[PDB]
Write an enzyme that holds these catalytic residues in place. Structure first.
Site, PDB file in Angstrom:
ATOM      1  N   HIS B  49       0.791  -1.249   0.017  1.00  0.00           N
ATOM      2  CA  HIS B  49      -0.054  -0.052  -0.197  1.00  0.00           C
ATOM      3  C   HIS B  49       0.790   1.118  -0.190  1.00  0.00           C
ATOM      4  CE1 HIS B  49      -2.717   3.121   1.601  1.00  0.00           C
ATOM      5  NE2 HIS B  49      -3.522   2.574   0.709  1.00  0.00           N
ATOM      6  N   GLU B  52       2.078   2.059  -3.590  1.00  0.00           N
ATOM      7  CA  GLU B  52       1.258   2.542  -4.482  1.00  0.00           C
ATOM      8  C   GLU B  52       1.054   4.023  -4.272  1.00  0.00           C
ATOM      9  OE1 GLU B  52      -3.014   1.490  -3.347  1.00  0.00           O
ATOM     10  OE2 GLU B  52      -3.903   3.006  -4.580  1.00  0.00           O
ATOM     11  N   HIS B  53       1.461   4.552  -3.079  1.00  0.00           N
ATOM     12  CA  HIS B  53       1.533   6.272  -2.807  1.00  0.00           C
ATOM     13  C   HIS B  53       2.699   6.737  -3.304  1.00  0.00           C
ATOM     14  CE1 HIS B  53      -1.281   6.993   0.755  1.00  0.00           C
ATOM     15  NE2 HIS B  53      -1.409   5.745   0.434  1.00  0.00           N
ATOM     16  N   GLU B 122       5.177  10.647   3.202  1.00  0.00           N
ATOM     17  CA  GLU B 122       4.004   9.931   3.015  1.00  0.00           C
ATOM     18  C   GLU B 122       3.707   9.283   4.276  1.00  0.00           C
ATOM     19  OE1 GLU B 122       1.721   9.793   0.188  1.00  0.00           O
ATOM     20  OE2 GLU B 122       3.066  11.349   0.090  1.00  0.00           O
ATOM     21  N   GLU B 129      -4.304   8.010   7.447  1.00  0.00           N
ATOM     22  CA  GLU B 129      -5.602   7.217   6.941  1.00  0.00           C
ATOM     23  C   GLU B 129      -5.920   6.253   7.855  1.00  0.00           C
ATOM     24  OE1 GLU B 129      -2.963   6.021   3.336  1.00  0.00           O
ATOM     25  OE2 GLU B 129      -5.026   6.085   2.043  1.00  0.00           O
TER      26      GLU B 129
END
Ligand code: HEM
Lengths: 55, 438
Positions: B49, B52-53, B122, B129
């Site tokens: 994940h 993906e960022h 990030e 999140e």
């Protein structure tokens, strides 16, 4: 006694009442449970159980 | 009759699969990868994940800003998602902007910077999140559902990963993940809409030819999950709506019972009080629920993975004193898949599904998603003729036999969120998985 000492009249009346009294006792046993149902069972900690009930 | 899906390979083992539609003017090209969170261990859980960022944070050529501009200038958009078993990166564009989009995708996958400065930036975004998924109740419910059903196993882990890992993910482990997993034999380049297959194969030879091949190439959609009957209760009295999921272990993509499980799921079906037609649906559960106002909605599901699945139902309800009735009637409808279903329900569900499986594919992105999913789970695109034949092969005997081995008297995984005081304990729910009268 139905007489001047314990005898036949007393025995016959004790039979009729001994047969009856368990039915009266069952009604009162039911009454105390209906009365309990408003608060529910207490529990060994003495606190509310409204937070955590089991069927 | 839809156009044929063309399929080619490169030398490295990258599959190219395309389905042209000369009636549209847009195209969806992208890369479906047979890899996801399930490929992480406990220490690097969250890496897929995280990547993906970073994929959109700048490459060896284009910086973050240049990347933004290049896509803006293309005119369409790029999108990505990481799941437990699958990663997708696609680009929707105009017909003649397809070579640009393939080139950008090839760049962000092969040649991403993963600069320590961007990792560190990030690391906060992703940390935030963790505290905002909390609002997406369906996702909260399904993530707890996987966590408990596959307790302490790779399918049970979340995609975001723990807070601890987010703070310790390095560019080294990111690079290692994508080097081990994003190999050519696990990847499919997919084009749907206004794409020529032969053009797409040339673009693949131009951009994806220097992809690593894995040492031991297994076929696409190659995987042992041990389901745990269990429950998670997340009671929150301040929420007005209860969200409940109940599931049993279901079927993998390649199970022989894959279609039988879909038909059984269609017999229960979905319901939503806000849709006008839902009060008139044929499903028995739908009728019980609507007549008695037991729920705002329910949705049956049959999720598949390479080696397991979850089959069950997701319910939402404001009726907090009748959650027991809602759960009771739902599980009694499941019991009837074992005891009572006949050709009446089975043929009705087959009718509804024969159309449903075709209806779903109504845009280039849906077509691309269908080609990509099928190629990475089954190794081939299954033609509608084959799908029609497999559905037709499902009889009422098959449904009853499947339900008797999968549902009847089986352990469930159960998640409840919200005002769920009325949801009874595990035993009373699990006792509804059988009928004493049968
Ligand atoms: C025929 C005789 C009786 C029967 C069948 C009976 C039955 C029961 C039952 C089934 C309960 C609920 C479960 C339990 O706590 O054990 C209960 C609770 C209770 N009974 Fe009785 N009972 C009887 C006699 C008595 C007597 C003689 C008393 C008091 C002097 C009494 C006072 C209570 C009380 C206070 C409770 C509530 C206790 C609590 O749950 O905290 N009962 N009874």
């Amino acid at each position: 006694w139905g007489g001047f000492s314990v005898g036949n009249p007393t025995l016959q009346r004790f039979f009729a009442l001994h047969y009856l009294m368990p039915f009266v006792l069952a009604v009162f046993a039911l009454l105390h449970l209906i009365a309990l149902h408003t608060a529910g069972s207490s529990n060994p900690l003495g606190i509310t159980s409204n937070v955590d009930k089991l069927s | 009759v839809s156009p044929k899906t063309r399929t080619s390979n490169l030398k490295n083992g990258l599959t190219i699969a395309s389905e042209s539609n000369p009636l549209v003017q847009t195209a969806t090209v992208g890369v479906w990868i047979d890899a996801g969170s399930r490929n992480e261990n406990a220490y690097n859980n969250g890496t897929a994940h995280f990547f993906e960022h970073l994929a959109f944070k700048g490459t060896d050529k284009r910086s973050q800003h240049q990347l933004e501009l290049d896509i803006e200038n293309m005119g369409g958009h790029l999108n990505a998602y990481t799941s437990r078993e699958s990663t997708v990166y696609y680009a929707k564009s105009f017909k003649d902007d397809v070579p640009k989009s393939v080139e950008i995708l090839a760049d962000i996958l092969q040649h991403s910077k993963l600069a320590e400065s961007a990792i560190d930036r990030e690391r906060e975004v992703i940390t935030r999140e963790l505290e905002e998924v909390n609002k997406q109740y369906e996702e909260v419910v399904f993530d707890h559902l996987h966590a408990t059903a596959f307790m302490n196993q790779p399918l049970g882990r979340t995609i975001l990963g723990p807070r601890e890992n987010i703070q310790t993910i390095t560019n080294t482990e990111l690079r290692k993940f994508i080097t081990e997993n994003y190999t050519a034999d696990r990847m499919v380049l997919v084009g749907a809409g206004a794409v020529d297959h032969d053009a797409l194969v040339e673009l693949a030879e131009k951009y994806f030819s220097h992809l690593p091949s894995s040492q031991s190439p297994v076929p696409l959609g190659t995987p042992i999950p041990n389901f745990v009957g269990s429950e998670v209760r997340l009671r929150d009295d301040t929420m007005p709506v209860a969200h409940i999921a109940i599931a049993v272990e279901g079927v993998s993509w390649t199970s022989e019972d894959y279609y039988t499980a879909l038909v059984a799921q269609a017999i229960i079906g979905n319901y939503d009080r806000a849709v006008g037609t839902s009060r008139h649906q044929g499903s028995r559960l739908s009728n019980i629920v609507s007549e008695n106002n037991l729920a705002n909605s329910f949705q049956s599901f049959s999720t598949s993975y390479s080696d397991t699945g979850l089959w069950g139902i997701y319910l939402t309800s404001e009726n907090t004193t009748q959650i027991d009735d809602l759960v009771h009637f739902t599980l009694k409808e499941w019991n009837r898949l074992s005891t009572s279903v006949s050709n009446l329900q089975v043929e009705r569900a087959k009718s509804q599904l024969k159309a449903g499986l075709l209806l779903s594919l109504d845009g280039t992105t849906y077509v691309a998603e269908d080609i990509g999913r099928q190629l990475t789970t089954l190794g081939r695109r299954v033609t509608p003729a084959e799908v029609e034949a497999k559905l037709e092969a499902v009889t009422e005997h098959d449904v009853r036999a499947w339900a008797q081995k999968t549902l009847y008297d089986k352990d469930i995984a159960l998640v409840g969120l919200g005002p769920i005081e009325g949801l009874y304990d595990y035993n009373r729910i699990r006792n509804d998985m059988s009928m004493m009268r049968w």
